[PDB]
Amino acid sequence: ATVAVVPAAGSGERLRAGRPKAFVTLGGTPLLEHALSGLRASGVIDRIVIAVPPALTDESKLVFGGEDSVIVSGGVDRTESVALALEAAGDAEFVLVHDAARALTPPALIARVVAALKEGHSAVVPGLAPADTIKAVDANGAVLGTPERAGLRAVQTPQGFHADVLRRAYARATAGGVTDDASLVEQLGTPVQIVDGDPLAFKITTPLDLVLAEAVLAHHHH
């Protein structure tokens, strides 16, 4: 079985007042609903576990629950939220962790992640070459160096794992600031394989992001 875990249980940004980025509306619909639709339309996800703010567990069950979608109370950080979601994941072979702010992620991208895991990769991440040159900077903001742009990937979600590989990684070190699940797995040198991402799987968090997302909805739906 393949389970998708969706941490939608809060925010470290004080501006947002504990409201997850996942609950922002897009075309009158929360980002989380768009993300769930993508996961379901991929046709490769058996169950989804969504971690939500504890106060909104009842509300989320009613709105986002279903035969393939389990709701759990989330944690104080993202790392705890994913950990709590993993409890309810059961005995899945594959676990995908998906950022619900990447609302317009195409279903095909999600299938690509699962397909690569079935080829035998333990850890799979969608990515694209960065549009801008990326530079390493020191604490001063002085350039340390410029890696080959073609040797870099801006990575997206869902990030896919063999379940035990992911659970072992989550078993150690809280350090809640982690947003990238593959990074946790990489601490032991576990191989991670990039598959093609998609420009549409951008994270929707800023006003400019939301402007782009609304514009995409217009082309797709109006």
Ligand X SMILES: Nc1ccn([C@@H]2O[C@H](COP(=O)(O)O)[C@@H](O)[C@H]2O)c(=O)n1
- The most distant pair of C-alpha atoms in the chain lies apart, rounded to whole Å, by 52
**Interior/surface letters 21-53, b for 16+ CB within 10 angstroms, e for the rest:** bbbbebeeebbbbbbbebbbebebbebbbbbbb
**Interior/surface letters 182-209, b for 16+ CB within 10 angstroms, e for the rest:** bebbeeeebebbebebbebbbbbbeeeb
Q: How near is the Cβ of 186 to its own copies at its closest, in Å? A: 6
What SS3 state is found at 219?
helix
With CB cut-offs between 5 and 8 Å by kind, which of its own copies, ligand X, none does residue 5 bind? Answer: none
Q: Does 174 bind its own copies (CB under 8 A)?
A: no
Q: Does 122 bind its own copies (CB under 8 A)?
A: no
Q: Does 200 bind its own copies (CB under 8 A)?
A: yes
Q: What residues are designated binding site?
A: 7, 9-14, 21, 75-76, 81, 100-101, 203
The residue ranges that bind its own copies (CB under 8 A) are: 125, 127, 130-138, 141-147, 149, 151-156, 179-180, 182-183, 186, 191-195, 199-200, 202-203, 205-206, 208-209, 211-212, 214-216, 219
Q: Per the annotation, where are the binding residues for CTP?
A: 7, 9-10, 12-14, 21, 75-76, 81, 101, 203
